[PDB]
Design an enzyme around this catalytic site. Structure first.
Site, PDB file in Angstrom:
ATOM      1  N   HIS A   1       6.894  -5.239  -3.627  1.00 33.21           N
ATOM      2  CA  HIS A   1       5.679  -6.047  -3.885  1.00 33.21           C
ATOM      3  C   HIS A   1       5.020  -5.541  -5.196  1.00 33.21           C
ATOM      4  O   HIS A   1       4.401  -6.298  -5.939  1.00 33.21           O
ATOM      5  CB  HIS A   1       4.649  -5.952  -2.724  1.00 33.21           C
ATOM      6  CG  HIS A   1       5.046  -6.602  -1.417  1.00 33.21           C
ATOM      7  ND1 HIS A   1       5.517  -7.901  -1.319  1.00 33.21           N
ATOM      8  CD2 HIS A   1       4.901  -6.161  -0.133  1.00 33.21           C
ATOM      9  CE1 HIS A   1       5.712  -8.205  -0.044  1.00 33.21           C
ATOM     10  NE2 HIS A   1       5.336  -7.175   0.699  1.00 33.21           N
TER      11      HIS A   1
ATOM     12  N   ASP B   1      10.567  -4.058   2.186  1.00 33.95           N
ATOM     13  CA  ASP B   1       9.761  -3.938   1.001  1.00 33.95           C
ATOM     14  C   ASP B   1      10.305  -2.767   0.129  1.00 33.95           C
ATOM     15  O   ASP B   1       9.541  -1.728  -0.119  1.00 33.95           O
ATOM     16  CB  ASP B   1       8.326  -3.630   1.421  1.00 33.95           C
ATOM     17  CG  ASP B   1       7.343  -3.585   0.215  1.00 33.95           C
ATOM     18  OD1 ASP B   1       7.607  -4.223  -0.865  1.00 33.95           O
ATOM     19  OD2 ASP B   1       6.259  -2.939   0.316  1.00 33.95           O
TER      20      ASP B   1
ATOM     21  N   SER C   1       1.673   3.128  -3.439  1.00 34.55           N
ATOM     22  CA  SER C   1       2.745   2.282  -2.963  1.00 34.55           C
ATOM     23  C   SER C   1       4.004   2.576  -3.724  1.00 34.55           C
ATOM     24  O   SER C   1       3.967   2.796  -4.949  1.00 34.55           O
ATOM     25  CB  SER C   1       2.319   0.826  -3.143  1.00 34.55           C
ATOM     26  OG  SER C   1       0.992   0.694  -2.553  1.00 34.55           O
ATOM     27  N   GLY C   2       5.131   2.587  -3.007  1.00 28.08           N
ATOM     28  CA  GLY C   2       6.439   2.854  -3.649  1.00 28.08           C
ATOM     29  C   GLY C   2       6.800   4.300  -3.711  1.00 28.08           C
ATOM     30  O   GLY C   2       7.930   4.622  -4.032  1.00 28.08           O
TER      31      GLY C   2
HETATM   32  O1  LIG Z   1      -2.054  -2.703  -8.583  1.00 26.06           O
HETATM   33  C1  LIG Z   1      -1.320  -1.687  -8.349  1.00 26.06           C
HETATM   34  N1  LIG Z   1      -1.536  -0.509  -9.002  1.00 26.06           N
HETATM   35  C2  LIG Z   1      -2.658  -0.276  -9.913  1.00 26.06           C
HETATM   36  C3  LIG Z   1      -3.244   1.142  -9.649  1.00 26.06           C
HETATM   37  C4  LIG Z   1      -2.984   2.189 -10.556  1.00 26.06           C
HETATM   38  C5  LIG Z   1      -3.485   3.518 -10.314  1.00 26.06           C
HETATM   39  C6  LIG Z   1      -4.244   3.800  -9.180  1.00 26.06           C
HETATM   40  C7  LIG Z   1      -4.538   2.734  -8.308  1.00 26.06           C
HETATM   41  C8  LIG Z   1      -4.053   1.426  -8.520  1.00 26.06           C
HETATM   42  N2  LIG Z   1      -0.226  -1.680  -7.508  1.00 26.06           N
HETATM   43  C9  LIG Z   1       0.269  -2.790  -6.743  1.00 26.06           C
HETATM   44  C10 LIG Z   1       0.581  -4.062  -7.331  1.00 26.06           C
HETATM   45  C11 LIG Z   1       1.095  -5.120  -6.555  1.00 26.06           C
HETATM   46  C12 LIG Z   1       1.290  -4.962  -5.173  1.00 26.06           C
HETATM   47  C13 LIG Z   1       0.998  -3.704  -4.587  1.00 26.06           C
HETATM   48  C14 LIG Z   1       0.479  -2.624  -5.371  1.00 26.06           C
HETATM   49  C15 LIG Z   1       0.149  -1.332  -4.677  1.00 26.06           C
HETATM   50  O2  LIG Z   1      -0.180  -0.286  -5.236  1.00 26.06           O
HETATM   51  O3  LIG Z   1       0.200  -1.378  -3.348  1.00 26.06           O
END
Ligand SMILES: O=C(NCc1ccccc1)Nc1ccccc1C(=O)O
Length: 228
Positions: A41, A89, A183-184
């Site tokens: 995702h 995922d 995430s990931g």
């Molecule tokens: O926007 C995101 N990272 C931005 C960030 C950077 C650093 C700290 C905090 C946030 N990631 C994602 C994008 C699409 C779907 C899921 C996620 C996810 O992190 O679950």
């Protein structure tokens, strides 16, 4: 990571930052010399964007001898992944070249035996995700130890209710948790990769809403097939 602590610099040589247009987006985990495992995702949002993988890093912004940014040859999302399901995922990123291995850059062995991590086992999750409820972003890698929470329990109603399949595992989220931006990244138990932080939106640090992690052993054929 909420309720955690700064990680020891380079003590997790497998940790990767998956970046979009030069900014941290998601965590990821080096699982072979040329391959990083992350969440699908994270990259749903992407095609208009350069994806790169930062290895060997502690700080996102400062130089370090071990720190190296790799371009990506191929992103391979799991074939059964879909928007708006937590299931399947996972994502494999093929680096443009094999990573230069050293004390600060090394793949993590991952779990191939499909049996659940025992409830209560303390596992380690690391990331550059939000560190508070305001949305603050750390420069430096953070980490927390979280106990695995039995699946039977995770499926109860005021919890996650029905969704948690045999391919998912849960951990406690009582003030200590992974959050957006983690995430990931890896959930590691006894030095082996067991889970990958899921990338669905959810509240962080609330005991009633446990962390969900994709079980890599559930996906061992797919990971083998992609690398092959
Ligand atoms: O926007 C995101 N990272 C931005 C960030 C950077 C650093 C700290 C905090 C946030 N990631 C994602 C994008 C699409 C779907 C899921 C996620 C996810 O992190 O679950």
């Amino acid at each position: 990571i909420l309720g955690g602590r700064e990680a020891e610099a380079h003590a997790r040589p497998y940790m990767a930052s998956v970046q979009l247009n030069g900014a941290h987006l998601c965590g990821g985990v080096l699982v072979a010399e040329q391959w990083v495992l992350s969440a699908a995702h994270c990259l749903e949002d992407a095609a208009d964007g350069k994806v790169q993988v930062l290895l060997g890093a502690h700080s996102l912004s400062q130089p370090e001898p071990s720190k190296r940014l790799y371009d990506v040859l191929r992103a391979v999302p799991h074939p059964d992944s879909q928007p708006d399901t937590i299931d399947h995922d996972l994502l494999l990123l093929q680096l443009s070249e094999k990573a230069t291995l050293g004390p600060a850059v090394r793949p993590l062995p991952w779990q191939r035996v499909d049996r659940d991590v025992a409830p209560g086992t303390l596992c380690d999750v690391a990331g550059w995700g939000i560190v508070n409820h305001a949305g603050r972003r750390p420069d430096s890698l953070q980490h927390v130890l979280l106990p695995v929470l039995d699946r039977a329990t995770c499926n109860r109603r005021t919890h996650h209710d029905g969704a948690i399949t045999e391919r998912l595992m849960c951990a406690e989220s009582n003030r200590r948790d992974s959050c957006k931006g983690d995430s990931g990244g890896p959930l590691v138990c006894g030095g082996v990769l067991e889970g990958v932080v899921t990338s669905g939106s959810r509240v962080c640090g609330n005991r009633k809403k446990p962390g969900i992690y994709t079980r890599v052993a559930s996906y061992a054929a797919w990971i083998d097939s992609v690398l092959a």
